[PDB]
């Protein structure tokens, strides 16, 4: 159905310990495909997915070029902001930039993004209309005014609606077997004795892609949201994800509970039951 491409950049100053560390990563949906690490020995944008390895030196040199440029920009950005906020040269600080685009089920442009955060707090963001800016603090105002004057938005709009969506489609095609796949979750349930009248029923979802999933428990078909421990979807490390939901069941009441699993790769949602 729908798809997205995202680039995440993190610059952290090492006052007195060299130039700031810069990490850049690229994603298509839930699959990372590239990365750059300033502390790394190669100093090149590197492939992280199989489908991007055979792009060619023009692609790699071009991206390496541009990512290095992102590095140099963020380096100056750190200084700008320590200044904007009156901070000392001693402290370590963080700049985070994220830009990308969403395409719908029909593969046409849907949403564009471009925003920054300073020390984990929103700094500036390109609005949905891709014409205006949401400026956080007093400091961000300088930036907003500057960017409005220079007509940065229109330049960003062109990329998000053009190049971003165009290359996303290309990547989708290039890596059709991975990106255009869906792995349904492998489900199972575990029972663990707690006391003499209580047991934990845990519902598992393993080896699924993409990461979106709805795992819930019910008692007599009634919601049990507030009574369910539900962990954060986690990466198995091989490209798939995992997730579990559990309920503490009064002994003899197992039959009353049903686990429900919803996922893109399932032909129909699952209703699991301990019996």
């Amino acid at each position: 159905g729908s798809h997205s491409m995202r680039y995440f950049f993190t610059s952290v100053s090492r006052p007195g310990r060299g130039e700031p560390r810069f990490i850049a990563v690229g994603y298509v949906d839930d699959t990372q495909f590239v990365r750059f690490d300033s502390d790394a020995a190669s100093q090149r944008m590197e492939p992280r997915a199989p489908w991007i390895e055979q792009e060619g030196p023009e692609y790699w040199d071009g991206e390496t070029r541009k990512v290095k440029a992102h590095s140099q920009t963020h380096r100056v950005d750190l200084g700008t902001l320590r200044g904007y906020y009156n901070q000392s040269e001693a402290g370590s600080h963080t700049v985070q930039r994220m830009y990308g685009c969403d395409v719908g089920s029909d593969w046409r442009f849907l949403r564009g993004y471009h925003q920054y955060a300073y020390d984990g707090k929103d700094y500036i963001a390109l609005k949905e209309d891709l014409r205006s800016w949401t400026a956080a603090d007093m400091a961000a105002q300088t930036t907003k005014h500057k960017w409005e004057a220079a007509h940065v938005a229109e330049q960003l709009r062109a990329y998000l609606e053009g190049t971003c969506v165009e290359w996303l489609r290309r990547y989708l095609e290039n890596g059709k077997e991975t990106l255009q796949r869906t792995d349904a979750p492998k489900t199972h349930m575990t029972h663990h004795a707690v006391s003499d009248h209580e047991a934990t029923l845990r519902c598992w979802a393993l080896s699924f892609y993409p990461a979106e999933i709805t795992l819930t428990w019910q008692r007599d078909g009634e919601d049990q949201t507030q009574d369910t421990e539900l962990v954060e979807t986690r990466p198995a490390g091989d490209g798939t994800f995992q997730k579990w939901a559990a309920v503490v069941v009064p002994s003899g009441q197992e039959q009353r509970y049903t686990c429900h699993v919803q996922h893109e790769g399932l032909p129909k949602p699952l209703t699991l039951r301990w019996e």
């Binding site: 690229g26 541009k66 992102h70 920054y116 330049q155 971003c164």
Partner: peptide, 10 residues
């Protein structure tokens, strides 16, 4: 593919 629009906060 990465953005190519040169951008500095300040």
């Amino acid at each position: 593919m990465l953005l190519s629009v040169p951008l500095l906060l300040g």
